[PDB]
Every structure is written in C-alpha cells, then in structure tokens.
Design a protein around this ligand. Structure first.
Ligand SMILES: [Mg+2]
Ligand SMILES: [Mg+2]
Ligand SMILES: [Mg+2]
Ligand code: NA
Ligand code: NA
Lengths: 290, 289
C-alpha cells in the first residue's frame, strides 16, 4: 500500500545516503537482504525491493547506480585500444586493453568509477563470445583501431552502460554485429538501441537478411517462434514501425524463411569474417540497417 | 559408420592444420567449415559436436588440445595471480591484483595461458554479485586467494581454468554457492564431478547448517527444489556416494527452506567478508563434501 511503500522508499534513500557517504554500493539482492533489518518496512520479496529502486531512479531522475544500487549481472568482455583508469590512495591503476592477450577485461557490475581513455575510431559490439574470441585472436581491434565489446545475448545493464559511456564520452560510433535472426535484431540489437541506457545512434552493420543472400551464408530455417517474433514486431513494435529499412528487412527475412548465424562465415574460411566480411560491411554504410 | 569415418578423417585433418598453424576452431566454426566437405559435411551442429566429443574420448585427449574450443567464454578472476603469454611483440603479463573494480575475463580456450601464483587457495564463487563484493573488499588480498566466479553452472573454460590452477599450483578449491538444490546439485556438483572434474573441490558454504547457524533470511523450497533433492537422493551417483551430502539434503528437506549466499548482507554488507568466510575457511568440519 501507499504508506508502506513510502516508508520503504524513505529507508531505501537513507541506505543510499550511507552508500554514497562510504563510497560503497549495494547489489539488488544485497539491498533486499539489508531491508530485513527494517522491522515492519522490510521487503516481502525481491521484486518489491527492485520496484522501489526502479521507482527512485524514475522519481529522482538519477541512474540507480549513482544512488549506489548495482546489478546482479556483470558486464561482458572488452579488448582493444582503450585504457581503463582508476584513482587510488596509492596512485593510479591502469588497465590497457591492448595488452590482455588471449583473454580480455571483464566489465564489472558497476562501471561508474571507471575512467576511460581512448583514441579508437569506433566500438564493435559483437553478439557471440565465439565471434569475440576469433576477432580478439586475429587482432581485429588493432588493424581497425576499434574497441571490441561482446554482448553474449541481450546485453546486461553494465554492458549497455559501458558501451554508452564510450559512445557519449568519446564520440564513438556503435557498430553492432549479431547473428542474422529475429532474436539478434529484435532483442539484442533492439535492447542496445531502444532499451535511459538506450543508444539511438547504434547501427546494425550485420548479419542482415540481405547479407545472407550476398555472402551466400549457410542457413537454418526460421522456427515457429522466429516467425511470431517478426510478425509481432511488424505489427506492434514502435522501433520497427519508425524505420522503413527495418520493416523491409524483417519482411524480407520472413519471405526468405531462413536465418544465419554470424559464425556461418567460417564456411569461407576462419579468417573470412576478419578479412572479407567485416571490412566490407564496416565500409559500406548503405548496407547497415538503420 | 562410413560417413562418420569420413567425417572423423576430415576433422582430424582439420585438427592437424589448426595445430600446424597455431590456430583454433570454435564448435560452430568447425560445423560451418564442414559445409565444404561434400558428402562428409555435417547435417547439423549436434552431429559435428558428437564427432568432436567422440574424438576426445576415443583418443583420450582434451578437445581443446586438438584445437576445438567451446562457444562459451570463462568467468571472471581476480587475486594473487599473473597470467603470462609469449607473443610476437614480447612477453605479456596480466597481474590479477591490478585490475581494480574489474577483473580478468577467462577466455574460451585456456590452453596457452601460463600461470604464476603464490596464492594459498582458490575461492570459487557462484554469483557475480558476491564476486563483486569480495573483489571490492579485497578478500583475495587479505586471505591470499584467487577468486573465480562461476556465474551459474560453470562453463567448460571456467572448469579448465580452476582445474589447471588447482593441479599445477597445489591449490585447494573452496566452493561458495547459494544454499539451495541448484547450488549444490548443479553448480557445485558440476565442478566436483568427466575429464574436467575436480574431485577434491569442497563446498564450504551456504550449507543447510549455515542457514540455521547464521539465522539467514530464507525462502520456501519450491516444488521443483523438493523434486531435485528427492531425485538426487534416489538416483544421483554423487549424492548416493556421499553420506554427509545425504544428511545435509535431508536436513534441507526437513527445513523446507533455501537461502541465497548474499542473504548474509542482513548483518551488514561486509559480514560475508569479515565474519562468515574467515570463520568457514578456518574450520573444515563445516565443509560438506
Ligand atoms: Mg544468437
Ligand atoms: Mg593465426
Ligand atoms: Mg543461485
Ligand atoms: Na514488500
Ligand atoms: Na552428419
């Protein structure tokens, strides 16, 4: 009810004050369990605690992480021309993302305290961890002076924040590379573009429906769920309804009746994505979706 | 058999070429490369995966040592550990005590990493949120331990990384999960019990007894949770092979509740670091396995 949520919001704001004064954070689950000390104002369930944090963000006009409340999910992996810098009592901590070798930097749950320095030309957001592995191994980021960020499915909040900060703070175009399927377009790419953390300038450079034809990619048939996702999008999705190229691309995929994974390029060689497809796709912005 | 024998020949020819060119192929990459093999092409991803698995088992050589790597990346690591690689541009050193708020992302294939550490043990943490708390409070520095998150059931790369650290540097593997059936029977069990198993891994906590001893905030076991326990007790070889695990699972059934590892935050955000973990690690009588 009214008064209970208000009392809980008051306790949550006192907790946020204590977090900020102690340079600390609380994950969403941590907050819920801290609320078990609030007697009759304790949260009954995790969702109710999350609801107050979401509502504080909406009511104060401040990102939840700036109030001290951070996600349970960590961010993805990053490699490339970028220094992540943190100030400490002893001095300066620098993580050079061109010196991580086979591995990468794991984006933390909260990226608020990271300082970012880079002369990269753009960010390449890559759906799969397997594709990130191939692009990292072949040093695609060096030749093309771009930051690689994996998404690993629909990007976590921390991943979205990391990419958005790079984009906004360093004027870096966000080029997105997903599988060529409805989930890639309407869930993974769409979440980056549309969602406070949205990046409206983000561009899907590929696997487009027309890419499947142009590069003759090994395909798989659309499944029942894929077709429904497309149809639902064309009818109800406001993102799809705003961009005629997206409407056309989705109608084309439905007519083709097939889809293709981004690693299907390996039929033409393990380096084909690195030396032929990506270079061609990044150069030709008439083939991007938006 | 005829087609599978042709496919196995082609897969080994591919493996030889990967090894000769110091390269790798992910599972999906292997499948799509096979679309060039005429009559020996794989019909679907599962068929390709099956040949790789069978090659690993028949030859007794890990997948990754033939050059075939997982699609999933590993988890995150911080602590007293240096990851070293010899490259064309010189030696690369990643010092896992100098990563700050972030951490090292274990790659899909850990075969070529060199590992140097003077750590005392490995703490394998289920949730990324608990990993973030232990990282931020520098639990790894205070207790000279490598923190490795699991993020649900551990990926193959994560398992391999923890196994290499354990075997090559003589480091006990202490596992810290939510106190629930999934944590015990899926997450911990996968780490402990298959070529990448770590039989000496020990579950230090959240045990059913911990739920009672620390008076943790709980949640009722769900329908599925009770079924997981009862199936585990009757048909699971790991559970049926350990009496202490049988005792703990029956105890959790009696209680009817489960607890998350982050529920220790009821007693303060640093209670896990300052009170719970220091206590649990000192006394091995509260560990489960
Ligand atoms: Mg996909
Ligand atoms: Mg090479
Ligand atoms: Mg859990
Ligand atoms: Na409530
Ligand atoms: Na086949």
């Amino acid at each position: 009810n009214q008064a209970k949520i208000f009392a809980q919001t008051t306790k949550m704001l006192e907790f946020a004050k204590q977090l900020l004064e102690t340079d600390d954070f609380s994950t969403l689950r941590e907050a819920y369990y801290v609320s078990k000390n609030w007697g009759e104002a304790r949260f009954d369930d995790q969702q109710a605690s999350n609801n107050v944090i979401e509502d504080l963000e909406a009511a104060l006009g401040v990102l939840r992480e700036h109030l001290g409340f951070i996600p349970e999910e960590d961010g993805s992996s990053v490699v490339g021309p970028l220094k992540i810098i943190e100030e400490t009592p002893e001095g300066e901590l620098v993580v050079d993302c061109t010196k991580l070798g086979t591995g990468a930097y794991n984006i933390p749950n909260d990226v608020t305290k990271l300082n970012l320095e880079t002369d990269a030309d753009f960010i390449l957001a890559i759906e799969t961890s397997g594709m990130f592995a191939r692009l990292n191994a072949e040093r695609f980021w060096d030749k093309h002076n771009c930051i690689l960020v994996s998404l690993k499915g629909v990007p976590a909040r921390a991943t979205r924040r990391f990419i958005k900060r790079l984009h906004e703070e360093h004027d870096l175009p966000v080029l997105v590379f997903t599988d060529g399927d409805p989930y890639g377009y309407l869930n993974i790419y769409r979440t980056l573009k549309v969602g406070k953390l949205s990046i409206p300038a983000a561009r899907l450079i590929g696997v487009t429906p027309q890419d499947i034809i142009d590069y003759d990619l090994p395909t798989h048939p659309l499944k029942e769920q894929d077709i429904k996702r497309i149809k639902d999008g064309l009818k109800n999705d406001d993102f799809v309804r705003s961009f005629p190229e997206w409407q056309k691309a989705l109608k084309q995929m439905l007519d083709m009746g097939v889809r293709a994974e981004q690693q299907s390029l390996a039929k033409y060689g393990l380096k084909y994505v690195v030396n032929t497809y990506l270079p061609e796709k990044i150069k030709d912005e008439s083939t991007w979706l938006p």
